[PDB]
Amino acid sequence: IRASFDKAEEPMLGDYPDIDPFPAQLKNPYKKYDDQQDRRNLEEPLSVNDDLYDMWSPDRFTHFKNQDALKYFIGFLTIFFGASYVATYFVPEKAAIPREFPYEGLWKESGGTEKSKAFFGQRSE
Amino acid sequence: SHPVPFSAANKKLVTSMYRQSLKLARNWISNRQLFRQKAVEIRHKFDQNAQISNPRLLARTLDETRAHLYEFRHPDPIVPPSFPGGTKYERNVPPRMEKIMQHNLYEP
Amino acid sequence: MILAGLILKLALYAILRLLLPLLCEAQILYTPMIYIISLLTIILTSLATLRQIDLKVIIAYSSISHMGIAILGVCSNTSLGIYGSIVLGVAHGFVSPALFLIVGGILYDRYHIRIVNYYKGLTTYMPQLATYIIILSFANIGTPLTGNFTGEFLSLQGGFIRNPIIGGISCISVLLAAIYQLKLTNKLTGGISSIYMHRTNDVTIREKFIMNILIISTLIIGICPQIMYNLLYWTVNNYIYII
Amino acid sequence: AEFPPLLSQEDMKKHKILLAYRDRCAALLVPLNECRKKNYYMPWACGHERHEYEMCEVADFQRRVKAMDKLKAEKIEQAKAAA
Amino acid sequence: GGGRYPFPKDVISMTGGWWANPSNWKLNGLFATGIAVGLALWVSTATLPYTRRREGITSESDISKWNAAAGVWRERHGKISTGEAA
Amino acid sequence: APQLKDPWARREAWRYQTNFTRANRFKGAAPGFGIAVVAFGAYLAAE
Amino acid sequence: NYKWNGPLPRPHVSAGHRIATKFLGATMFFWMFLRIKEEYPAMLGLHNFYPPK
Amino acid sequence: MYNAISLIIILPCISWLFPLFFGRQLGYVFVTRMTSTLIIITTLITYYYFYQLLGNNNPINLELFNYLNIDYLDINYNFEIDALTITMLLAITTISSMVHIYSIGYMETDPHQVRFFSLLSMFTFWMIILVTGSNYFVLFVGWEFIGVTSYLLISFWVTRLQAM
Amino acid sequence: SSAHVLTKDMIQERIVALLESFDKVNDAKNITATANLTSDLGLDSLDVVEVVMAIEEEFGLEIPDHDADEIKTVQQAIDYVSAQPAAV
Amino acid sequence: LFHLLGHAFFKALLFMSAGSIIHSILNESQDIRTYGGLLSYLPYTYICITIASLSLMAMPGLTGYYTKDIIIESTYGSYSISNYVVYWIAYLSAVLTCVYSMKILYLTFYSNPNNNTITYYNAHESNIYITLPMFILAIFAMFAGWILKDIYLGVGTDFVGTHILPNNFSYFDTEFSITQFYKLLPLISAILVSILIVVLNEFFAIVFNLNNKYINTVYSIFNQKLVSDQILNHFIIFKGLVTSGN
Ligand SMILES: CCCCCCCCCCCCCCCCCC(=O)OC[C@H](COP(=O)(O)OCCN)OC(=O)CCCCCCCCCCCCCCCCC
Ligand SMILES: CCCCCCCCCCCC(=O)OC[C@H](COP(=O)(O)OCC[N+](C)(C)C)OC(=O)CCCCCCCCCCC
Prior knowledge:
Largest interface: E-H, 39 and 41 residues
Structural class of chain C: mainly alpha
Oligomer: part of a larger assembly
Distance between the termini of chain C: 41 Å
PDB class: membrane protein
Chain A: Subunit NIAM of NADH:Ubiquinone Oxidoreductase (Complex I)
Organism of A: Yarrowia lipolytica
Entry title: Structure of Yarrowia lipolytica complex I at 2.7 A
Radius of gyration of chain C: 19 Å
Number of strands of chain C: 0
Strand content of chain C: under 5%
Bound molecules: 1,2-Distearoyl-sn-glycerophosphoethanolamine, diundecyl phosphatidyl choline
Keywords: NADH:Ubiquinone Oxidoreductase, complex I, membrane protein
Strand content of chain G: under 5%
């Protein structure tokens, strides 16, 4: 099947052949080719965008069409993070206050100077 | 079209469909007994329809099995490791024992 | 070799010698336009490299992105950026002629063709060449302990200091370099050896001599870049306009 | 009381206690960690000292639980006073 | 050996190649072990003077003096610590 | 009623015969359990 | 002596593999029993650190 | 004439480079055994350093030559083995040791064992470098080089397109 | 370790056992190298498929359609399985 | 840090075990749908892989317990109110590790044969260079966690001296606040789900082989890495190549 980027180059092919691209990954592996790894016979015409449809191109996935795949992917992410957000309203209350520290929140041991307590001071006591 | 019910083309087509269904059953089903059960059931479904005569109902049934095979595809099929979709396929290929072809009159 | 190594660096030297010492106020007003042009030159040229079919052409396109990073560095008004641009010039002048040797004097002298579709699996009969290709590729994309990384790092430091947004977006150079270089290296070194190519000799002592000189130099200036500072500790402060 | 004497800032610094452990119960952490250094931190060594520090911290935890007890009771008091 | 196939004998790699196991490898291994032990001894002995512990190298009186000098500098230049501008 | 017999059953029979029965497919599991039970009993007796 | 559809014989595993199997499993189960014996309250949640209410 | 840190750093580099220099001269037998032995010695040294650090916990440092000192940017080749580092090194050295001894039996009948063992030790060396550095630059050195080594090791079977 | 080699006699033994344990065969002592699957062994247009699948499973193979349909004699199957280096 | 150190040992053991399994098959196959009943054939590999899988399932005494249960507990002990949900997320991943290890163990060792017969005739344990590493790593994956516990997870250890903010230290609260339900549900869940998966696969295997289109589509998304390698390759890499050609 010719895609957008393939049939956009129709006004520019001129005398070059307009070839229907079919990726080599999906070609039949059990036939015998001159280049068995690349799945190509010698004088086989190459599409203008053969770089995209050769075996060194990125992998195709046949089981799910790509739009449905995006539906499932973004659906999983939305289910996860939406349930994560909803579950925050159903959280129990804590049973103990946070820890507290002796010398006015250790503002000196954390780098304070008696005006920097709000920045470096830890919890009250 | 003209899908003859008792020709060689129909033989190839239906044998291929039977192979595909049995391989899908092997791939989907982990247990051996259930796989054999499903294979026998598939053979029963094929033997029920081995007697069809009308090419229209035949073509409908063939389209139906195509849809069933597309519906029960497997994403990660079992392939032996040394065969094209396998883990070992092009692992250590013996190199072609070619001789050196020279390109310069002076450089080895 | 001469072009990519020296004539492209004449422009960097020309900036530093003709345009910064004179014209300081025009430069300090214009340099955001320089940053526009440099970021475009980086990203679009790298992506354009990703769809080329000729090897020497790929290396040629690769020169442009690194010179754009050097321009970010030299037009940064930061000492580290100037030093980085100069180290980039030197290290690219070492590494890019080595790649040009591989793709225009080793392979082109054996096969007289440069189309990528013919080349595959050089590792089997030509292993030393494959080692050289991998080394020079990972040097060209900016692996540490090569001067390419030092220069890229300091040029991008300067660009970030001057314009954090542009200088930060320009750090996808580190990725795109890897893409367009390793997509070629992986095919050349990888797979079964091509059916369109007969076997030929591996690299000779001469080719290896050249590549080894050019690798030793970049590894020296990547492991200790500081050895170039005794001729540049004035130059890194002579062209800085800060009151 | 259940808590040991609070260390002074100068001895906290002398023993180089991490600030997360510079609490009321740090006086029992010192011998534990010196014993650990002495016995190479193995688990069969410093049981008594570890138990002492752990029970001191359990006491602090019970105290904080009672603080949150008081806070919840106060908020319910304020609630039924607000209606 | 087992599982082996033909390979070109005129291919020369710095690594072995195909099942490299020359019939002098004990002598060459002796040489390589000698060079390795010597290089390791050289590196260790020569890098002894460049080693140090983290602690106990600088007296805390030096640290006190340096921090005090820092405070002197900071109030000479009229500077306040972080957070005090509130 | 929904019952049919396998024409490959004589080929598939060895997958449930000796060393593949429901017994033999679990005998080697927990190999040294009894030795451990005995040794731990001795240990607790040596308290 | 290959029965291509028949009941396959018992495997001829070596003695060192039979002895090392019963040594690791024995060590594993013994270690598990001992750690459970000396840490059942902590791993089961029997110590209650909360105050008496 | 004993440096835990320097032995730890240099012995894996030997195990990496000496096969690459001398593989056609040594063969896969000696290369396997030598790389194994060197990683084993590094592992024992790390265990002893871990013992000593639990005893004392004063980390050793190793301050070598200067990379870049231009304008306010002082980067040196400085290394250190602290608590976090020695833990990561326990993991690294132990698993590399066991993997080296494991791949003698696994990768027998492979024609390219020398390169395989060289690359395993390459990864070991650069991970030691990653963890021992006292600055982010040495970390990045190790980072990038372990990426390189991962590429080469995943690409070990170069004839397999999917591996590439 | 993996000290195992295949031979034509071994393939023949395994295939004749495979066919002997198939219930839809006519009966035994029709099974030889020269035997035909359709005529002599009396197999349908899908029991041949079941046999080819069983051969795949036995020798660890994958037999495409263009190589499956052209198996109509037992010797043909033996030839085919011996012409595959990964026949286990 | 502690879980990193333990994971190294028992995961390297798992992969070594898998390599020995892969080499026990004549055709070195990696699919668990083609292994079957290799228990009596590969007993040493079995005990090593189950040691590692139990020290990954967080069973008592082993390194997985000490290294992994404390994180699921610190999810609850964290001072932040919102981290309670992460308890349940981590819990489900735990009761899933039980699943995807017991699946391996059953399909590889306990199940009925699925390979041909010659595979089991030639199935054998591998040589000393493979087994000795597996032995040492099993010893590690049994003992090292209990050894290094008081170094890494102890009360006030000071060994790894990362300067945690005092407001953020939640370990003392984590070990004490945790009640019986939130302390025992991970372990009991593991010990139950393992038995259930084995029992279902052995007696009620139809539960996993229903042949439903709506179950199979979900299996297929989860079998294709949550269509994650199709989204990247199509919508990023391929569109990048197209924009690059443009
Ligand atoms: C479009 C303009 C983009 C400009 C900005 C740059 C964006 C990122 C770069 C994308 C550019 C396109 C790259 C195209 C290169 C493709 C080259 C190639 O042919 O290599 C293919 C290779 C995969 O080979 P594969 O088919 O998968 O085989 C698998 C079997 N082993 O493929 C690869 O190796 C892929 C390498 C690239 C990886 C990109 C990963 C991006 C994912 C982002 C996820 C989001 C994470 C959160 C980030 C937060 C940021 C704030
Ligand atoms: C840091 C500065 C550089 C360090 C020195 C590196 C050069 C030493 C000589 C290596 C010889 C060699 O690797 O040979 C090259 C190998 C030969 O493979 P083979 O094992 O001999 O079998 C021969 C079987 N063929 C012929 C079928 C392949 O070809 C390759 O597979 C390509 C991978 C290159 C490995 C690169 C080595 C790691 C260096 C990476 C640093 C960035």
